[PDB]
Amino acid sequence: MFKPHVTVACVVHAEGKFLVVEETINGKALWNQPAGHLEADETLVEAAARELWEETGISAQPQHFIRMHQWIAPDKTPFLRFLFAIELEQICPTQPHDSDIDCCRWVSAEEILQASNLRSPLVAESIRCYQSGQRYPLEMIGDFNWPFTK
Ligand SMILES: [Mn+2]
Ligand SMILES: [Mn+2]
């Protein structure tokens, strides 16, 4: 049965900047949203909150649903990437709990769109969706008669 990879990602915004994670991937440092795979017996939204925590060490629940992109990666690996928005009042400290993460930067929209080191083109598209003002309720992609405790 064809299954596809399912990932979650978060636009995090505060004081006019966005949070970005810097991973080194074979020798170069790239930027992504905080993003991750969805794991088993997990809610998308739950998954987004864990990947945020793991990649940045921020405790925050995703606040809205921006959009989902379905795309294929350069090596033909298929994705359903669920994108979310969180707003905070101010830039908050960060501390990744994942080894693969080198660091977090808080950066302007135009730095992300001009940047030549993005992990994929969805990283800038993401900022383009955010900026369109598109958001939705979390309930758009929510769970149904979930067996486990939230
Ligand atoms: Mn991760
Ligand atoms: Mn992960």
Coordinates of all heavy atoms in Angstrom, one line a residue, residues 35-36 51 54-55 98, ligand 1:
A35 N 10.4 21.5 11.8 CA 9.6 20.6 11.0 C 10.0 19.2 11.4 O 11.0 19.0 12.0 CB 9.9 20.8 9.5
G36 N 9.1 18.2 11.1 CA 9.4 16.8 11.5 C 8.4 15.8 10.9 O 7.5 16.2 10.2
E51 N 7.7 18.5 17.5 CA 8.8 18.8 16.6 C 9.3 20.2 16.9 O 10.5 20.5 16.9 CB 8.5 18.6 15.1 CG 8.3 17.2 14.8 CD 9.6 16.4 14.5 OE1 10.7 16.9 14.6 OE2 9.5 15.1 14.3
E54 N 11.5 19.6 20.0 CA 12.7 18.9 19.8 C 13.7 19.8 19.0 O 14.9 19.8 19.3 CB 12.4 17.6 19.0 CG 11.6 16.6 19.8 CD 11.3 15.3 19.0 OE1 11.5 15.4 17.8 OE2 10.8 14.3 19.6
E55 N 13.2 20.5 18.0 CA 14.1 21.3 17.2 C 14.5 22.6 17.8 O 15.6 23.1 17.5 CB 13.5 21.5 15.9 CG 13.3 20.2 15.1 CD 13.5 20.3 13.6 OE1 13.1 21.4 13.0 OE2 14.0 19.3 13.1
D98 N 17.6 18.4 19.8 CA 17.9 17.4 18.8 C 19.3 17.6 18.4 O 19.7 18.8 18.2 CB 17.0 17.5 17.6 CG 17.2 16.4 16.6 OD1 18.4 16.1 16.3 OD2 16.2 15.9 16.1
Ligands
MN1 MN 13.2 16.7 13.6

